[PDB]
Structure formats: structure tokens, C-alpha cells
Amino acid sequence: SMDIDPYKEFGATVELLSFLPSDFFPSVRDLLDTAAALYRDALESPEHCSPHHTALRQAILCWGDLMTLATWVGDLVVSYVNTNVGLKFRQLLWFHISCLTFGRETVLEYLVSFGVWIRTPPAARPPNAPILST
Amino acid sequence: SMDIDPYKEFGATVELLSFLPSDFFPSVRDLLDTAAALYRDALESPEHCSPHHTALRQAILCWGDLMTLATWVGTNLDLVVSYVNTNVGLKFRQLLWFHISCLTFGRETVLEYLVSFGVWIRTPPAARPPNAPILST
Amino acid sequence: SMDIDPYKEFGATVELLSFLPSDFFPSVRDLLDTAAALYRDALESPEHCSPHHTALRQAILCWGDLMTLATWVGTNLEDPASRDLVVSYVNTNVGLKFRQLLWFHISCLTFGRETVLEYLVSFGVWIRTPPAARPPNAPILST
Amino acid sequence: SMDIDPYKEFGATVELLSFLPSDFFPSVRDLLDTAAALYRDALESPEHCSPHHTALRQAILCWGDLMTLATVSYVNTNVGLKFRQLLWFHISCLTFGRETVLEYLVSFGVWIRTPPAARPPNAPILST
Amino acid sequence: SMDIDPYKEFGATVELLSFLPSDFFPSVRDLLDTAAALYRDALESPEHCSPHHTALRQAILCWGDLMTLATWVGTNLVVSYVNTNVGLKFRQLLWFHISCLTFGRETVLEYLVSFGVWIRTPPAARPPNAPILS
Amino acid sequence: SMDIDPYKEFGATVELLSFLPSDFFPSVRDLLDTAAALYRDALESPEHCSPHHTALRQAILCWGDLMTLATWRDLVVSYVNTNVGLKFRQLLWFHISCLTFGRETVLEYLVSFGVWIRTPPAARPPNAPILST
Numbered sequence: 001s002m003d004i005d006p007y008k009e010f011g012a013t014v015e016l017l018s019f020l021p022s023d024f025f026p027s028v029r030d031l032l033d034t035a036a037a038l039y040r041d042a043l044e045s046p047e048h049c050s051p052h053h054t055a056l057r058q059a060i061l062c063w064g065d066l067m068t069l070a071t072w073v074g075d076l077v078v079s080y081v082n083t084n085v086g087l088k089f090r091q092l093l094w095f096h097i098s099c100l101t102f103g104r105e106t107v108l109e110y111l112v113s114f115g116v117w118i119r120t121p122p123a124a125r126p127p128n129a130p131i132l133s134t
Numbered sequence: 135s136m137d138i139d140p141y142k143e144f145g146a147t148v149e150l151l152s153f154l155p156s157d158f159f160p161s162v163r164d165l166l167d168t169a170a171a172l173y174r175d176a177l178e179s180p181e182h183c184s185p186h187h188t189a190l191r192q193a194i195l196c197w198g199d200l201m202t203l204a205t206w207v208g209t210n211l212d213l214v215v216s217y218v219n220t221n222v223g224l225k226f227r228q229l230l231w232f233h234i235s236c237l238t239f240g241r242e243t244v245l246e247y248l249v250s251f252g253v254w255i256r257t258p259p260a261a262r263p264p265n266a267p268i269l270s271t
Numbered sequence: 272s273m274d275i276d277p278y279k280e281f282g283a284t285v286e287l288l289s290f291l292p293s294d295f296f297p298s299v300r301d302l303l304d305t306a307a308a309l310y311r312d313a314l315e316s317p318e319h320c321s322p323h324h325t326a327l328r329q330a331i332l333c334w335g336d337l338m339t340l341a342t343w344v345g346t347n348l349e350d351p352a353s354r355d356l357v358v359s360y361v362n363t364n365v366g367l368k369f370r371q372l373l374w375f376h377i378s379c380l381t382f383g384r385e386t387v388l389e390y391l392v393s394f395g396v397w398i399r400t401p402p403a404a405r406p407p408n409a410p411i412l413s414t
Numbered sequence: 415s416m417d418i419d420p421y422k423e424f425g426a427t428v429e430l431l432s433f434l435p436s437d438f439f440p441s442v443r444d445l446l447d448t449a450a451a452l453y454r455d456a457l458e459s460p461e462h463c464s465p466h467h468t469a470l471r472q473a474i475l476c477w478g479d480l481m482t483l484a485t486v487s488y489v490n491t492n493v494g495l496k497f498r499q500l501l502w503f504h505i506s507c508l509t510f511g512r513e514t515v516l517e518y519l520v521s522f523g524v525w526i527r528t529p530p531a532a533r534p535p536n537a538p539i540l541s542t
Numbered sequence: 543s544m545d546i547d548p549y550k551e552f553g554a555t556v557e558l559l560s561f562l563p564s565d566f567f568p569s570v571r572d573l574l575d576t577a578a579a580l581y582r583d584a585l586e587s588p589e590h591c592s593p594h595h596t597a598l599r600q601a602i603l604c605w606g607d608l609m610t611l612a613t614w615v616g617t618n619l620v621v622s623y624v625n626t627n628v629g630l631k632f633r634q635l636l637w638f639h640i641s642c643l644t645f646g647r648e649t650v651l652e653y654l655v656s657f658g659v660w661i662r663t664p665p666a667a668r669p670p671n672a673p674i675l676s
Numbered sequence: 677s678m679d680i681d682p683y684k685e686f687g688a689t690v691e692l693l694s695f696l697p698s699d700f701f702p703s704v705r706d707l708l709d710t711a712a713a714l715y716r717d718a719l720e721s722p723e724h725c726s727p728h729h730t731a732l733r734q735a736i737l738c739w740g741d742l743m744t745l746a747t748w749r750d751l752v753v754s755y756v757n758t759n760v761g762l763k764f765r766q767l768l769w770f771h772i773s774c775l776t777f778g779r780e781t782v783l784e785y786l787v788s789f790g791v792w793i794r795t796p797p798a799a800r801p802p803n804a805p806i807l808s809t
């Protein structure tokens with residue numbers, strides 16, 4: 001059987017996105033709303049635009065597929081998707097939306113800095129976390 | 135029926151204004167007080183001034199109409215306050231904020247700020263920078 | 272009757288000063304002490320100095336007149352518990368009027384009318400922004 | 415009868431020092447320790463040094479006499495405030511100069527009178 | 543018996559690493575995940591890379607052995623002791639090598655003394671922002 | 677009897693060190709650990725190094741002698757931390773800081789902090805003075 005890593009073609013790995021703690025990522029609702037707010041025109045375009053655009057299109061739709069099945073169930077069902085699957089798509093949606101805004105290299109440097117920073121005990125950790133920028 | 139977007143002639147949309155959370159926008163009272171404090175002479179002027187001015191005039195007046203109708207109900211006949219706060223109040227808080235800010239700072243500056251804040255406030259407290267984006271020229 | 276605006280000859284209006292919330296203005300006492308600390312020699316001078324000085328003098332004097340009446344009312348009102356409500360009227364209603372006026376004239380003399388007016392609007396906009404969005408540092412008055 | 419202002423020969427007044435609130439000034443003890451720590455050799459010198467030194471000498475000695483008399487707490491706040499202003503005024507002038515001390519006094523007095531909603535987070539400071 | 547200092551060939555000492563308080567160092571887990579996130583390609587490489595890489599390889603593995611042994615006590619027959627005493631040893635060692643690989647030996651050492659002096663200053667006198675790495 | 681000031685040959689006084697409040701100085705333990713971490717090789721050297729080194733050697737040793745005696749109940753510990761403990765916390769801090777930053781820097785910082793911490797909170801600047809080369 002196959003083992004495909006969604007981030008490998010984009011220069012990262014599943015293990016790398018997991019270096020960021022689970023409570024770092026915005027909610028799925030807030031990420032989808034931002035993909036719309038920032039990239040709706042391109043996401044709906046007939047042009048490919050970029051591999052990030054192509055991947056982001058499918059991620060949005062797939063979460064739609066998971067939600068349409070969960071909402072057709074009825075509460076206990078919706079909890080399973082949000083608990084298990086939810087973090088997976090919060091990393092994926094965050095990765096692609098951030099890469100489109102700031103660039104892939106900039107996103108990866110930020111990911112490591114934050115992961116090291118958030119892991120430093122509070123007694124020693126600098127007051128300002130690293131920030132993302134161009 | 136028609137489908138008119140009040141922000142479309144100004145290069146924005148309802149969905150775009152709604153990217154800002156409900157507790158971002160000032161009160162209805164504080165925005166009207168600011169429209170007067172900043173633009174009374176022009177808002178009351180016989181000149182058009184600008185499409186923002188023309189639109190801003192109608193919004194203030196409309197909220198006047200909405201308030202008079204709801205007040206004439208209570209004065210001449212409580213859940214109506216709940217309905218207004220949920221539905222109508224936010225709609226006009228977004229509209230008054232959009233036009234007053236656009237008049238002061240320019241439309242491009244307002245839109246860039248709207249997306250930055252909408253992204254910033256959506257970042258969990260563990261990761262978001264301490265100071266939010268600011269509006270300026 | 273007439274309709275006189277104390278701020279009209281100074282390039283502002285009552286509505287404009289009220290754009291600042293009541294808790295923005297210092298106390299009447301602290302404003303009188305600052306007029307004294309900064310401008311006593313001129314306030315007591317036989318020269319006009321400036322229209323702000325002429326107006327500031329009368330406001331100080333007028334607040335004195337209002338104070339003498341309240342203190343005469345306190346000493347001469349048999350109704351004891353009612354004096355608390357009578358003293359409250361001055362601090363609640365008339366006090367704010369003179370806190371705006373004394374602040375306007377003292378600040379205009381120090382920083383200039385333009386600087387005062389621009390600062391007033393920036394603060395009025397800033398204090399009205401909900402805490403989630405407004406910058407931590409309010410605008411400041413300076414030259 | 416006479417009406418002598420301790421600050422008048424030094425270019426200020428009693429009313430001016432009182433423009434600073436009561437909780438601005440350090441304690442009397444903390445000012446005396448500082449007068450010693452900064453100027454002990456000059457205060458104890460047989461040379462005049464400066465009118466600020468001459469005045470500061472008498473204030474310290476006077477405060478000692480006032481302390482013996484008490485050993486009323488409200489009175490200690492009244493006379494104590496008078497000497498907290500005086501000891502602070504003369505020590506600060508010796509360090510930073512009279513003009514610098516006076517501009518700081520008014521800047522701070524206006525600043526602390528601004529309600530918390532409007533006053534800048536960082537107060538005015540003394541500097542050389 | 544011998545008296546080998548793991549830090550001596552790297553230009554430091556045990557006494558120097560212990561100048562940092564116990565609550566300064568991240569957890570063993572957070573340090574291992576960082577070694578993986580930052581260097582796992584090099585740690586797993588057949589090339590020496592550097593003496594730090596060689597030492598970091600052995601430390602990670604040794605902590606593996608210590609965990610297997612303490613965990614075998616619960617499964618086959620304590621673990622708390624391994625968390626406290628040996629844990630601090632490997633929290634210092636893993637932090638030293640990961641930090642040296644990222645920032646350099648001199649930078650790591652200067653920071654260590656500055657922080658040790660800073661954290662020892664009573665709160666009344668010490669500056670609000672601790673020293674940082676660069 | 678004599679009247680010896682440990683700080684006099686170093687250009688300071690007991691009164692000046694006491695201008696710093698008692699809660700300014702690190703613990704006795706943290707100062708000894710810092711002397712070791714920063715200067716162990718010199719403290720143990722057969723060379724003089726400097727008069728600061730010579731004094732710091734004797735102070736450390738003296739605290740050892742004093743500690744054995746005190747550990748030889750809450751009132752004895754209160755007395756030691758109040759009188760003798762502060763004495764060596766000032767001394768160990770003075771010499772370690774002078775070795776690191778220089779005597780002038782230490783003395784200027786001491787007066788600045790002594791005035792700063794004596795300022796009431798309403799007027800005192802947010803950021804305290806710091807030591808620096």
C-alpha cells in the first residue's frame with residue numbers, strides 16, 4: 001500500500017507540522033473564513049495558480065465532505081471529526097494559507113522558531129514570541 | 135428581486151466586513167457621535183462631497199427611521215431590543231465604521247487593516263503578537 | 272434669549288468638547304491648581320495677555336461664585352441629609368461644564384489651539400474603539 | 415511679623431513644591447540616607463559649598479529636633495510633608511540643577527493630575 | 543575508575559551547566575522532538591557531521607536505554623527517580639548540544655553565565671527581560 | 677581596638693553598601709555559586725590576581741567558618757540572615773560585581789539604584805538602572 005505525505009511536495013513533513021502544539025492553530029471555521037477572505041477569487045479560478053492553491057482547494061472540499069457526512073448523521077458524530085480529524089486539517093489549512101501569504105521558506109523558519117520558543121520554560125522564555133513577516 | 139451589496143460600489147463586500155468580529159465595532163451611539171464630530175459640516179452640506187458622504191448620510195437617516203419605528207412601538211404599545219441588537223445593530227455598526235474610516239484613512243488602507251486584524255484576532259493567544267495591527271496613513 | 276457658545280470665539284464648540292468622556296477631564300481642583308502653577312502671574316496681571324487669559328479668569332471666578340453659593344447653602348440649609356444631594360448637583364452637572372472649559376483654556380495656552388483640537392478628536396476616536404482593537408497607548412498632547 | 419519663604423531665595427515657592435502630591439515624595443528617612451550617601455562629606459565640611467548645602471544642613475538638624483519632640487501622627491504627616499518637600503527639593507537641585515528640577519516638577523504635576531484613562535504610561539523623568 | 547566530563551571536550555564543565563537552575567531546561571520530550579525536528583537527517587546520517595552530532599546521537603540513545611529500563615520496571619515488576627535525577631542530567635546535555643549546534647559554543651556559554659546571574663538577582667533589581675540567544 | 681572598613685581600600689564604605697536595601701542582594705548561596713562559576717580557577721590560583729580576589733578568597737572561607745557554627749532555632753536563623761547574612765551578601769556582591777564591571781560602574785550603579793528604589797511607585801521610572809561595561 002502507499003504512504004503519501006501531503007507536505008513532502010511542499011518541502012515539509014507531517015512530523016514537522018506536528019512540532020507546533022495543537023493549541024497553536026486557529027479553528028477550522030476561522031481558517032476557512034480566512035481562505036475565503038484572502039484567496040476566494042483564486043481558489044474559485046479556472047487557472048491552477050499554484051500547487052498550494054490546488055492543495056488548498058482539495059483540503060477545503062475534503063473538510064466539507066467530512067462535515068457533510070457528520071452533519072447528516074443527526075452530536076456524538078460531530079465530536080469525532082472535530083477531535084480526531086480536526087487537528088489534521090487545522091495544520092494543513094494553516095500551512096497552505098500561510099505559505100501563500102508569506103512564502104514557504106519564511107513559514108518553515110517561523111515554525112521551528114515558535115516550536116523552540118513555546119518549549120522554553122516560562123522563567124527563561126522571551127516575552128515576545130517570534131512573528132511571521134516578509 | 136434585487137441583490138444590492140452596500141459595499142460593492144466601494145470595493146468591498148458584506149462577507150468582507152463580516153470577517154471582523156462583532157465585538158470589534160464601536161457602538162452605534164459612538165459612531166454617530168464621531169460622524170458628527172468629524173464631518174457634521176459636510177454631512178449637512180448641499181454638496182455631494184463624495185460617494186462615502188452620500189452613503190453615510192442615508193445610513194444615519196435610516197438608523198433614525200429604524201429607531202423611530204421601534205420606539206413608537208414601545209412608547210405606544212423588550213424582545214424588540216434583543217432583535218435590534220442581534221440583527222440590525224451589527225449591520226449598521228459595520229456600515230458606519232466602514233464609511234467613517236474610509237473617509238479618514240482611505241479605502242485601500244482600511245481594507246488591508248481589516249484583513250490583518252481579522253487574521254490577528256483569529257490567532258490563538260499563545261501565538262498572536264501582543265499588539266494588534268493599527269490603522270494609519 | 273441669546274445663544275452664546277464659550278468655545279465659538281476660540282474655534283471649537285460645546286458639542287466638540289463633549290466628544291471627550293466625563294472621566295477624561297481632571298478635577299476642578301487639579302485644574303485650578305494647574306492654572307495657578309502655570310499662569311498665576313498673568314492671570315492676576317493688569318494686562319489682557321490673550322483672549323484665553325480673559326476667558327480663563329472669568330471661569331475661575333465663576334467657579335468661585337458657584338462654590339460660595341454651595342458653601343452658603345450647606346451652612347444655611349437645615350435639611351441635613353439633603354446637603355449630600357445638593358452638593359452632588361454641582362459635581363455632577365456644573366462641575367463637568369467647568370472641567371471641560373478649564374481644561375480647554377489651560378491646554379490651549381500651553382500647546383496651541385490646533386494641537387489641542389487634533390488631540391481631542393484622536394482621543395475621542397481611540398477611547399471609543401473596543402478594548403480588543405484599540406492600541407495600548409492613547410494619543411498624547413505635545414508640541 | 416515676617417513671612418519668610420524657604421524656597422524663595424532658591425527661585426521657587428511653597429505653593430510650587432505643594433504642586434507635587436503627598437505620595438510623590440520619598441520618606442524622610444530615605445531622603446536623609448540619600449543626603450548622607452551623596453553629600454555627607456560636603457554637608458559635614460567647614461566650607462560653605464553652596465546655599466543649597468547651607469540650607470540642607472539646617473533642615474536635617476531641624477528635623478532631628480522635631481523628632482525628639484514627638485518622641486500626633488497626623489501632625490507628623492503635616493510637618494513631615496514640609497520637610498519631605500524641602501529635603502527633596504535641595505537634594506534634587508544639587509544633583510540636577512534648579513531649572514531641571516522645576517520643569518520636572520510642573521511636568522509631573524500636570525501628568526499625575528491626568529486621569530488614568532488619558533495619561534501616558536511613562537511619567538516625566540529627571541535627567542542631566 | 544576514570545573521571546570523564548561529557549562537556550570537557552566541548553569546552554565546558556558539569557559545574558557550569560549546573561549553574562542553570564533546574565526549571566530552566568525544557569522537558570526531555572520537548573528536547574528530543576526538537577533534535578528530530580532540527581537535525582534528524584544529520585543525526586541519522588552515516589557521516590560524522592560534527593563532534594556535537596556524535597555526542598547528541600549517543601545521548602538520545604542513552605535516554606532510550608534509561609527509559610526502557612525504568613519502563614520495564616512497571617511492565618515486568620522508580621520511574622519517578624529516573625524522571626528527577628537522570629532526567630536533569632539529560633535535560634542539560636540535550637539542551638547544551640542542541641543549542642551549541644544551533645548557536646555556537648561561545649554564544650551558548652556567554653548566554654549561560656548571563657542568565658545564571660540574571661535569574662539569581664532578586665526580582666526588585668533584575669531587568670524585566672532576561673538574556674536571549676543569538 | 678581597631679576600626680577596619682573592608683570596603684575602604686576598595687574605594688567604598690559600609691554605609692554606602694548599606695544604602696542598597698536588604699532585599700536587593702542575591703542569596704549567600706547564589707553568590708558563592710556565581711563566584712565559583714565565574715572565578716573558580718582564579719580563586720584557587722597560587723597567584724594573587726587582584727586585591728578583589730584576595731578579599732573574596734577570605735570572605736568565602738569566613739562564611740564557611742560562620743556557617744559551621746550556626747548549624748551547630750528560628751531565632752538563631754533570623755539573627756544570622758539579618759546581621760551576618762546581609763554583611764556577606766553585600767561583601768560577596770560588591771567584590772564579584774567589581775571584578776565583572778569595574779569599581780566605578782559598580783558605585784555609580786549603586787547610587788542610581790539606591791535613589792531609584794527610594795522613589796515612590798507613583799513617580800519612579802519603570803526600568804531600573806542596570807550594570808554595564
Ligand SMILES: CN1C[C@@H](F)Cn2nc3c(c2C1=O)CN(C(=O)Nc1ccc(F)c(Br)c1)CC3
Pocket residue numbers: 113114116117118119120124125126130568572573576636637640641673674675676
Ligand atoms: C525563539 N527564540 C529565539 C532565540 F533567538 C532567542 N531565544 N533565546 C532563548 C530562547 C529563545 C527563543 O525562543 C529560548 N531559550 C532556550 O533555551 N530555548 C531552547 C534551546 C534549546 C532547545 F533544545 C530547546 Br527545546 C529550547 C532561552 C534562550
Ligand SMILES: CN1C[C@@H](F)Cn2nc3c(c2C1=O)CN(C(=O)Nc1ccc(F)c(Br)c1)CC3
Pocket residue numbers: 026030031034035093094097098130131132133250251253254255256257261262263267
Ligand atoms: C497580523 N499578523 C501579521 C504578521 F506580520 C505577524 N504575525 N505573525 C504571526 C501572526 C501574525 C499576525 O497577527 C498570527 N499567527 C498566525 O499563525 N496567524 C494565522 C495564520 C494563518 C491563518 F490562516 C490564520 Br486564521 C491565522 C502567529 C504568527
Ligand SMILES: CN1C[C@@H](F)Cn2nc3c(c2C1=O)CN(C(=O)Nc1ccc(F)c(Br)c1)CC3
Pocket residue numbers: 160164165168230231234235267268269270271393394396397398399400404405406409410
Ligand atoms: C488614535 N488612533 C490612531 C490611529 F491612527 C491608530 N488606530 N488604529 C485603529 C485605532 C486607532 C486609534 O485609536 C482604533 N480603531 C478603530 O477602528 N477606531 C475607530 C474607527 C472609526 C470610528 F468611526 C470609530 Br468611533 C473608531 C482600531 C484601529
Ligand SMILES: CN1C[C@@H](F)Cn2nc3c(c2C1=O)CN(C(=O)Nc1ccc(F)c(Br)c1)CC3
Pocket residue numbers: 297301302305373374377378410411412413414521522524525526527528532533534538
Ligand atoms: C506629562 N505629559 C506630557 C505631554 F507632553 C504629553 N501628554 N499628553 C497628554 C498628557 C500628557 C502629559 O501628562 C496628559 N493629558 C492631559 O490632558 N493633561 C492635562 C492637561 C491640561 C490640564 F490642565 C491638566 Br490638570 C492635565 C492627556 C494628554
Ligand SMILES: CN1C[C@@H](F)Cn2nc3c(c2C1=O)CN(C(=O)Nc1ccc(F)c(Br)c1)CC3
Pocket residue numbers: 656657659660661662663667668669673702706707710711768769772773805806807808
Ligand atoms: C543579566 N544582567 C545583565 C547585566 F549586565 C545588567 N544587570 N545589572 C544588574 C543585573 C544585571 C543582569 O542580571 C542584576 N543585578 C545584580 O546585581 N546581579 C548580580 C550581580 C552579581 C552577582 F554576584 C549576582 Br549572583 C547577581 C542588578 C543590576
Ligand SMILES: CN1C[C@@H](F)Cn2nc3c(c2C1=O)CN(C(=O)Nc1ccc(F)c(Br)c1)CC3
Pocket residue numbers: 440444445448501502505506538539540541542788789791792793794795799800801805
Ligand atoms: C534612577 N533614576 C534616574 C533619573 F535620572 C531619572 N529619574 N527621574 C526621577 C527619578 C529617577 C531615577 O530614579 C526618581 N524620582 C525622584 O524624585 N527620585 C528621588 C529624587 C531625590 C531624592 F532625594 C530621592 Br531619595 C529620590 C522621580 C523622578
Ligand SMILES: [Cl-]
Pocket residue numbers: 036037038039040041042
Ligand atoms: Cl478575494
Ligand SMILES: [Cl-]
Pocket residue numbers: 127128129260261262263264
Ligand atoms: Cl507573544
Ligand SMILES: [Cl-]
Pocket residue numbers: 170171172173174175176
Ligand atoms: Cl465639522
Ligand SMILES: [Cl-]
Pocket residue numbers: 264265266403404405406407
Ligand atoms: Cl492591542
Ligand SMILES: [Cl-]
Pocket residue numbers: 307308309310311312313
Ligand atoms: Cl506664574
Ligand SMILES: [Cl-]
Pocket residue numbers: 407408409531532533534535
Ligand atoms: Cl494610555
Ligand SMILES: [Cl-]
Pocket residue numbers: 450451452453454455456
Ligand atoms: Cl560624600
Ligand SMILES: [Cl-]
Pocket residue numbers: 535536537798799800801802
Ligand atoms: Cl511611571
Ligand SMILES: [Cl-]
Pocket residue numbers: 578579580581582583584
Ligand atoms: Cl531534518
Ligand SMILES: [Cl-]
Pocket residue numbers: 123124125126127670671672
Ligand atoms: Cl523574560
